Design a protein around this ligand. Sequence first.
Ligand code: L8N
Ligand code: ZN
Length: 259
Amino acid sequence: GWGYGQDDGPSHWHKLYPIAQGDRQSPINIISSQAVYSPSLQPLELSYEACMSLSITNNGHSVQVDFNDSDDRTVVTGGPLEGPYRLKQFHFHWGKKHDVGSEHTVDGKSFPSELHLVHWNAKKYSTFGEAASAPDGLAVVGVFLETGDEHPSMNRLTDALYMVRFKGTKAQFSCFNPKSLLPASRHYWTYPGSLTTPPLSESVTWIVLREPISISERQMGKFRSLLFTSEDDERIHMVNNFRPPQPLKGRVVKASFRA
Ligand SMILES: NS(=O)(=O)c1ccc(OP(=O)(O)c2ccccc2)cc1
Ligand SMILES: [Zn+2]
């Protein structure tokens, strides 16, 4: 019952999921001058192995790469987190045109796309779904994408999109190391927030990396060639699959660096 169309888009989600109007909703506009430098935070480490990826799937709302999460070999730790969170999946949000598509914004600025690497507290909860209901359940690392030079590692993923263009299709996607989609800086902003798609549960520690990665226009275009629709429907391109900034409601944004 939800999507990114004119009738079922983010402005209407609250009609189905009242938490849409809650006190810790994501994404947000990060006002860099208002972020609080927090030097006691631990260094953020993304400890990712090369061959933990399973498949790539067009689920109707994004393209998502799922991971074997049955041990603690692909984890985020440090920064604001009290212990390791295992990577379950990553996916993207992007725009129709070149200058929108990210969910978080910085000082009002959007990026063409935003990557989400989605991690759960498996040491505490027995399932991703269970963790996704609890305030300390999830840790999502957000990476902005800008267009510029072609990203070599990205080719593997953008070349894979043809076969998952229609909603509900998937392909095997082995030995894709998500470390290859990270910037050379580990500086970040962190705040307590929510899933940015229903059920919009306020269960996420957001870690938005300060530095964007760059992919080419051709690469960005491959994402725009995905469809929201299945093989036998009128084609509707999967674009503008992002939720806009939500009210801060007096939450504190911390930063690992001085702006
Ligand atoms: N876009 S975001 O904030 O990174 C996000 C949103 C929803 C998520 O959960 P989800 O994959 O929709 C799910 C929920 C409950 C049970 C199974 C799966 C994960 C990340
Ligand atoms: Zn997301």
